[PDB]
Symmetry: D3
Subunit: 259 residues, 6 copies
C-alpha cells in the first residue's frame, strides 16, 4: 500500500522579501522539502531538493545565484544518499516528478537511471530558454542531461494521474514558474494530501497576505492559489505549503510517514 515520506535537503538562507515579496531585507531561513511515495507499482521521487553537490561546493555548482539563496545541507541529505540509507537503491525509482525546474527542485534529475521524469512541457522549454531575471534559478548541470527520459505534459494533462489510480495527480499551478505544478495525493489512511510546493511558499501566501518574492506571473500565481483553495475545500485535503518554516516541524518527516 502507498506511503508518503517528507524529506528535506537542509535549508536555504535568503532574505524575507525573496519569499514574501517586498517584505524587507531581513535574514530568513526555509526548509527545502522533497517527497518519496512508495507505491506497489514503483517508487516515486518528487523534485529531490537541492543537488547533493551543494553540500560541498554551492558557489562552484550553483554559481552567482548563491548571492541570493545560500544552501545549508550535508552530503548525506542528497536524495540519492538519503534513499540508499532508507533502503532504496537508485535503480529502484520508476518516476521522478518535477513541480518545476528551479535550483532547489532539480536534485533528483538524472540521478535515477531508469526513472521517467514527468514535468510540464512549458517548464522544460522555459528552463532551457529563461529570461535574465530567472536564469540563475535554473541549473543546467541538473536537468540538461541527454540521457534523461522525459514525459513532457501538455496543457490538456492538468490532473495527470501517474499510476491511473488517484494516488498521485499533477495539479497545474502556473505563476511562481511558467510550468509549475502542484500535487494532490490520496493515501489509504491519511486521505487527501495537497502538496502546494511553490504555488504557496508559506501560510501567509496561502492566506493571501504575501505574494511570491520570485515569480513569472503574479496574475497566474494568485489564481493558482485560489485554484488550490477550491481543491482543498472540495477534497478536505491536508495542505502542505512549499517552504513554511513554522508549519514544517508540525509534519511528519524522516523515517515517519503518512499512510
Amino acid at each position: 500500500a502507498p506511503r508518503l515520506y517528507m524529506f528535506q535537503t537542509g535549508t536555504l538562507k535568503c532574505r524575507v522579501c525573496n519569499i514574501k515579496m517586498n517584505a524587507g531585507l531581513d535574514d530568513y531561513e526555509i526548509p527545502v522539502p522533497w517527497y518519496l511515495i512508495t507505491h506497489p507499482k514503483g517508487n516515486v521521487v518528487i523534485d529531490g531538493g537541492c543537488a547533493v553537490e551543494c553540500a560541498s561546493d554551492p558557489k562552484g555548482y550553483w554559481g552567482d545565484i548563491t548571492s541570493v539563496y545560500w544552501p545549508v545541507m550535508r552530503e548525506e541529505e542528497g536524495c540519492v544518499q538519503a534513499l540508499k540509507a532508507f533502503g532504496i537503491e537508485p535503480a529502484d525509482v520508476r518516476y521522478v516528478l518535477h513541480s518545476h525546474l528551479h535550483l532547489d527542485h532539480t536534485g533528483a534529475t538524472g540521478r535515477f537511471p531508469n526513472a521517467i521524469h514527468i514535468v510540464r512541457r512549458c517548464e522544460y522549454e522555459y528552463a532551457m530558454a529563461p529570461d535574465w531575471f530567472s536564469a540563475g534559478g535554473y541549473i543546467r548541470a541538473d536537468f540538461d542531461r541527454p540521457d534523461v527520459k522525459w514525459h513532457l505534459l501538455e496543457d490538456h494533462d492538468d490532473g495527470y494521474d501517474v499510476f491511473g489510480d488517484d494516488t498521485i495527480r499533477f495539479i497545474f499551478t502556473p505563476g511562481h514558474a511558467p510550468g509549475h505544478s502542484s500535487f494532490l495525493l490520496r493515501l489509504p489512511e491519511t486521505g487527501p494530501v495537497l502538496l502546494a510546493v511553490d504555488a504557496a511558499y508559506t501560510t501567509d501566501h496561502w492566506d493571501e497576505k504575501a505574494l511570491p518574492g520570485f515569480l513569472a506571473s503574479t496574475v497566474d500565481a494568485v489564481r493558482s492559489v485560489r485554484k488550490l483553495h477550491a481543491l482543498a475545500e472540495k477534497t478536505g485535503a491536508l495542505v502542505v505549503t512549499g517552504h513554511d518554516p513554522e508549519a514544517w516541524p508540525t509534519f511528519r518527516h524522516a523515517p515517519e510517514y503518512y499512510a
Copy 2:
C-alpha cells in the same frame, strides 16, 4: 502650429522603495507623477492625466485603503483639467485621451474631457473591471467606470496604433506591469523620436535591468517589454523617458516649457 510635447505632473507619490524596485527594502521613496499633453493641428491629446484632482483634497475618501501604499501629494491646481485651463485649453478642446494603463495615478483624465475618445488596450479595460485581489486597489472605478465615456478599445493586432495617421503618436504595447500596459513613441518636428516608457520602466534602474517592477502582473512580460523598448530606442535613436525616475525627472523640460 506644429506638434509639441508638454510634460506635466500631478505632484508626487510617497511609497517605499520596494513598491517601485521589487524587494529593494522598506525605506521611504517619493516619485513624480508625470502626464503628457501633445498639442497637434488636428486636435489636442492628453495621456493618462495623472492622479485624480479629488486626491488633492481627500485622498483617503477617493482612493481608499490603497493610500497606505501610495500617498498622493498634489495641489488642486495640478489636476489635469485645472492645469489645462490655466495653460489655455478648455476641456471640450481635447480630441483624444490616451491611456498607458488604468492604474490610479494614470486615470485622472478619464471622462473629464467631454468630447475625447479614450484609447486603451481592450485587455487593460477588461482587467480593470475584473482585477485580482492583489491589484484591485490600484484601479479606481470612480475614474474609469463612467457610462458616457467614448472608448476605442485596442485589440492585440493594434500594436503600433497611430493616433493621427501621421507617425506622430504610436502605441507601443508593453505588457507586464499591467496586462494591457502600453508605452508611447512620439515623433516631433525638432526633437525627433521620444519614447515614453511610462510604467514599462519605472526608473533608469529598470531600464538597465538592475531592478524589477515592485507592482506587476507578469515578470516574464515585463522584462521582455523592456527589451522590446531597448530595441525600439536603438533602432530610432529615441530620447528615452522612464515612468517615474526621480533623478531623471528634473533633467527634462516641464510645462510651461515643451519639446518641439
Copy 3:
C-alpha cells in the same frame, strides 16, 4: 439522505417571442424562470436562484431600463432565500451556489448565502464585469458585484467540473448564449442522468434546431453547444430539461416535489 433535485421558479418573464426564438415576431410571450436546489449529504447546492427577490416589489428600480424587454412577474415568497426558508433550509446551510451564467434572471442567489462558494466560468464573470452595449442591460451588478462573495472561477480546462467529486453534479460548458454559459449534468440515485440545459437551449424548438436564441453572444458557439448536448444526452440517456420551455415546464415535478 441521498441527493435530490428540486425545481423551483421565481415567477415568470414577459417578453416577445423574438427575444426567445430569434426573429420569430413581436407577439407577447411569457416564460417560467426556473432555478434548482440539489440537496446532498455533503452540502446543499443552489443553481442560479432565479430573479432577485427585489424584482417582486420594484422591478424598474432594481433592473432599470431592461424591464421594457423582460418584465419579471413574481411574488416575494418566491425569492430564493425566502423559498428555501419556507422549505426548511436557512441561508447559512448552502455550501455552493452554481451559476450557469450571470444574466439577470440567474443571479437572484448571488451573495444571498453567506457561506456559499459561488462557482462560475471565469470568462463569464469577466464578461459580466465588462459587457458590450448590447448585453450590458442583462447583467445586474447589484446582484453579482458584491465584495464579500467567495468565487471559484472555473478555467477553460475545467469542463466537466465535478462539484462533490462523486459524479452527481457536473458543469457542461456550453458557450454561445453567453460567453461563459454552462449547462449541468446531474446524476440522481433513482432518476439517473438529468441534463439541465439552462439557456443553452431556451425551448424544445432550440433543442430541435428550429429556432436560434434571440439573445446571444455567439451563434456559432450556440449551435455547436446544442449539438454537444445532443451527444451527451444520446450517450447518457439523460432526461433533457430546457431552460424556459413554457409547454414542457408543467410536465416536470416542481418543489415541493422532487426527483429522487
Copy 4:
C-alpha cells in the same frame, strides 16, 4: 488614376428582422451593392453581388434559401455582363476581393479568368464547413471551383494593402461572418471611403440601434462596428453601409463614380 464605381445586382426581398434582428416580420427590400476600382495597375472587383444565374432561376441555383432571401435582378446586372457593357472584359480583372462568401457576395467568384481572389482564410474555411444555420447562405457552385486562384489572408494580414499604395485596404470586421472584412479606400479627389459591407447593414446598425439579423458572433459584430467608428473618426472617411435602402440612392452609381 484610381476610381470607385458602385454597382448593384438588383435587390433582395426578405423580412425586416433578417436585417435588423428581432424587428418583426414585415416585408423589406435591400439593394445588393458591389464595387469596381479601376486602378492603373489592374482592375478590382469586390464581391460582385448575386450570381447572374439568379436572374433566370433563383430556386434552382440558390435552393431553399430563397425562402428567406428572394433576389430580384436582371440578367444584364450580372457582374460579368455589367463589366462588358462598361468596357471591361472578364480577362481584364487582376483581383477579386471578397468581404465574405455569403450568397449575395460570391457572384464574381471564378468569373474572371486571371483574377486572384483575396479573402480571409477563416472565411474560406468556414464557407467549406458551415454550421446548419449558415449553410444556406454559402453557395458552393460559386466559390467551390478548383480553377480559382486564392490568396487566403491570415490574422496578421488585417490592413492588407492590395497594391501597396494605400488605395485599397482590408479592414477585418468579424461578426456578421467569421472572416468578414470591410474595405477602406483612398481616392485622389474623394479621399477616404469606408465600405463597411455587412459589418453594418444599415444606418441603424452603424448607430447601434439594431443588430445584424444574421450573424456568427454578436460580440464580434458590435466590436467590429466600433472598430469602424474609430476608423471613420480618425480618417474622416465617407461611410458606406452595406445595404441601407434609404442611404443607397444618395451615393453615385451606374456610370457615375468617385475619383
Copy 5:
C-alpha cells in the same frame, strides 16, 4: 456480454517505402489496411472501416490521381459493410463510427451505417473540407461529404473522450500525421488495455523513433504524439498496435478471432 475487439483489413496498399518512412527510398512497399470492430453491449462500434468498397473494383475511378501514390489491392468482399454482414452484423446495427482521421484508407465506413453517429475531431472534419494542395488527394469527399451523416465533432478539450462512459473506448488525441488525427485506448476484460496507434505510428520503426511519417501535417506534433503514446503505453501496460506495420500485422489475431 463483455466487449470484444476484432481486427479486420480492407486488403493492402502498394506504394514506396518513402511514402511510409519519410525519405527512405523509392523501393516498392506494401502495407495492410486495418480497421476495427468493437462489439459492446450498448452497441457496435466501427473504427474507420478501411478503404471504400468502391475503390476495390475501380481504384482510379473512385480515388483519382492519388492512386499513383497508393494503389489499393482489395476484393469487394473486404468492404466493411460486406465483411460485417458476413460476420453477422447488418449495417443498421452499428451505433458509432469512430474516425482516427479522414484520410482515404480510413473513410470506408462513413455514411455506410444509417443509424451511426460518426465521432471525429472537429479540426479533422474542417481540414478535410478545406485541405492544402499536398493533402487534398488524400481526402475522398465522396466518402465523408454526405449530408445524411450524423456527426459528433469533438473539440480540443475533448481529449480522452469516452464513447460509452465506461473506459472501454477512449479517444487519445495524436495530432501530426493529420491535424485532427486520433488514436484509441481500449480496455477489454481478458486482454486488458489495447492501444490502437493508427496513423500516429505507421510502423514499429516510427514507434522506435527510427522513421518519420512520409505523409504528415506536422512533424513536431507527430513526434510528440508518438511520445505521448509511449507514456500512455508505459503507464497502462497496453498492447501496442501500430497503424500499418507489415511485419507485426500477421502476429495479431484477425477476424474471425478476437480480443476479449
Copy 6:
C-alpha cells in the same frame, strides 16, 4: 550612399535529393549555402552567415552525427568573418545579424560580430534551445548558445519587421521549414524589390508546388508560407531568390558583384 545586396556562399552541402525534396529518392545531391550582406548607410547587415567556419576544417568535430546527412564542402576563407574582412569589413563594423532561422547552415554569423544585434523570431530561438529529436542535430549550440550575444527576439505580431524603418529590409514570417523561420523582402534603389525566400522554398520545384521540404516542422505551415510569398512576389514584382536552388544559383550576381 544607397544600400546594396551582396550574395555570398559558404561552399556547398552534399546530401541526398530526398533531404531537399521530400521522398524524391536517395541519389547524391549538392546545393550551395548562400548568405547575404546588405550595406546600408546606417550600418552593415549580415543575414545568417552560412555554415560555421569551424566546420570547414573539421566537419565531424564541429557538427557531429548530422554530417552523415549534410556533408559541408567549404574552405576556411569562405567563413563569413574571413570573407567580410577580405571584402573590406572588419567584424566590428556589422550592426545587425538577421537570422532566417537557427539551423546549422544559417548560424555561421552568430556571435562572430561583437557589436551586432541578432534579430530572430523568439519561437525559433526557444525551439533551438529545446528541439525535438528529429531536429536536434540541425541546431549547433556552439554557434547560437553564447551568453555574450545581444538578441532582439521578435514576437508573433512582429511580422513585417522593418530593420531600419525605411522599407529596405523587412522580415516576412514563413513558418513551416522551422517553427520560427523567416524570409526577407528587400527594396533596393536600382534593382527594386528582392524576395529572399531562404528555406521557405529550397528550390524552384518547391516554389512551383512540385516538392515539399525534406526537413520541416510543419507541412501545413510550409505550403501556406510558400503561397504567402507567391502573393507577396506577385504584388511587388520582386526578384524571387530561392534558398538553395542549384540550377538557379549561378544565374544571380555573387560577390564581389552586387544588386543596387
